Amino acid sequence: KQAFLILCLLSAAFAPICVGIVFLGFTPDHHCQSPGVAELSQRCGWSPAEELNYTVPGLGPAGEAFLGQCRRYEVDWNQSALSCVDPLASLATNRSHLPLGPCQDGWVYDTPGSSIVTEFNLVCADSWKLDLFQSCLNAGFLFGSLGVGYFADRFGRKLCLLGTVLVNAVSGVLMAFSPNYMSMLLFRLLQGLVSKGNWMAGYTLITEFVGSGSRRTVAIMYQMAFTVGLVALTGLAYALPHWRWLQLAVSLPTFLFLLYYWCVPESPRSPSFADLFRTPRLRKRTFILMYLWFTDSVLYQGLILHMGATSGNLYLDFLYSALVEIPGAFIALITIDRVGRIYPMAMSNLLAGAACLVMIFISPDLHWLNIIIMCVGRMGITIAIQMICLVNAELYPTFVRNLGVMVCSSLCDIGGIITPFIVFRLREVWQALPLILFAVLGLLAAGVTLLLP
Ligand SMILES: COc1ccc([C@@H]2Sc3ccccc3N(CCN(C)C)C(=O)[C@@H]2OC(C)=O)cc1
């Protein structure tokens, strides 16, 4: 067999594109850059933990990290009258009376590597642009979920697949060379236009190469290829501390695999949209399936982004959480053939919602319990997604199955568009608000799931 390994490699290469923002876009601690502070520190011998205390504005009640991240004291540090023990005491009687200003002179990031945030200065006022990086990719997924069918209708299937692979590889390689943010967003959108199209085309091909009597195992293996790709992305991210190097090391393997994938012997081998709603039972099924797809995509992406934004040891937490899918995949494989798909999916959704709810009250120092809860939630959502990827095949007849899959999977992309703004922006108002929303969505999805036959 040759198609199996190469198609699993193709599926594994989709993971760094989808969840790569966790390592390409990490946000280190930062503060306003102020000239003259370096020379004063050299004169006074200030350690980094001492300079970060003397100059950068301190934390207020309940944290309030904004005053240090986006503001600075407008004081002429060049004056020699400043005391080496404490320069702020010679300025004014009260520290709160000193003038305040934005980071006009730049930023200082406490990290040896770099990311898009550290290079394009997507912090404070510009910090809302980081969500746009994922939103553009999800918009590309949404557009490719509808344009790829027409493209493959007007063009040869294998040639269209080859063209999409080539375009994806070229776009991924080109992104690492972007000189500014707008061009990078253009390449991100172009890559997202073809990434999900390639994934679905590979799914269809791998389900065609094996008869309908064994599609489950094939689909589960294709899914676990994504977990293998996540593990490889974690390894590469640990090895390479800069985002351009990681982008090259991610995109290049696909292009080189294209050089080896010229031709293989097994390669060359109307329903109406209104029909889904004219009948009450099918309308109910379509509504429930759309809601479940949206909720599961929101929960999965939100959990990964929250882990990326809040975990204190990102590499090990990502490595642990990624490995839990494989036991989840095996659990799903055992469960489907024995006790059906409805109850297991409902229980997985309930477990995910409960895990989201419990995680709110955990103190920050209990990292060993927080990671266990995160792993449980990830296993729950993984099992739920595995179940829902197979239930759709039964409720829809072959006459309208492909249209139903295309329609239902389109809401996942809208959820992907909405999700970054929920995770990143609502966290400003209250750190527990995204967790509350995720818990509510998970519990509601668990409740509604019982209605499916
Ligand atoms: C009918 O066949 C399909 C297959 C896959 C999907 C999307 S593709 C996607 C895009 C971005 C992030 C994750 C995913 N994964 C992969 C999940 N991993 C555990 C493998 C899904 O399963 C998505 O569906 C969801 C979210 O429920 C839709 C329809």
Residue numbers in the entry: 19 to 287, 331 to 514
Task: Quote the original article.
Additionally, anti-arrhythmic drugs such as diltiazem, a calcium channel blocker, exhibiting plasma serum concentrations above the IC50 of OCT1 after administration and could similarly contribute to cardiovascular toxicity. The OCT1-DTZ structure was solved at pH 6.0 as it was necessary to reduce the pH to dissolve diltiazem (due to its lipophilicity and lower pKa of 7.747), but no significant structural changes were observed when OCT1-DTZ was compared to the other structures solved at pH 8.0. In OCT1-DTZ, a pendant ammonium group was close to E386 likely forming an electrostatic interaction. The aromatic groups in OCT1-DTZ were both located near F32, W217, Y361 and I446 which maximized hydrophobic interactions, whereas the additional methoxyphenyl moiety of diltiazem was proximal to W364. Polar interactions between diltiazem and Q241 further stabilize the ligand in the binding site. The hydrophobic pocket of OCT1, with a specific charge coordination through E386, likely favors molecules with a pendant ammonium cation tethered to a large lipophilic or aromatic core. Docking followed by MD simulations of diltiazem (n = 3 × 500 ns replicates) correlated well with the modelling of the cryo-EM map, with an overall RMSD of the ligand of 1.4 ± 0.4 Å calculated across the combined 1500 ns of simulation. On the other hand, the structure of OCT1 in complex with diltiazem (OCT1-DTZ) showed this compound formed electrostatic interactions with E386 through its pendant ammonium cation. In comparison, the smaller localization of a positive charge in the pendant ammonium of OCT1-DTZ generates a stronger interaction with E386 and these compounds are stabilized by additional hydrophobic interactions. Compounds with cationic ammonium pendant groups tethered to an aromatic or hydrophobic core pose significant risks as high-affinity inhibitors of OCT1 as seen in OCT1-DTZ.
Organic Cation Transporter 1 (OCT1), a member of this family primarily localized on the basolateral membrane of hepatocytes, is involved in the uptake of cationic molecules for hepatic metabolism and excretion. Here, we present cryo-EM structures of full-length human OCT1 in the inward-open conformation, both ligand-free and drug-bound, indicating the basis for its broad substrate recognition. The overall architecture of OCT1 in our cryo-EM structures resembles the classical MFS transmembrane arrangement of pseudo-symmetric 6 + 6 transmembrane helical (TM) bundles corresponding to the N-terminal (TMs 1–6) and C-terminal (TMs 7–12) lobes. The structures also show a large extracellular domain (ECD) between TMs 1 and 2 unique to the SLC22 family.
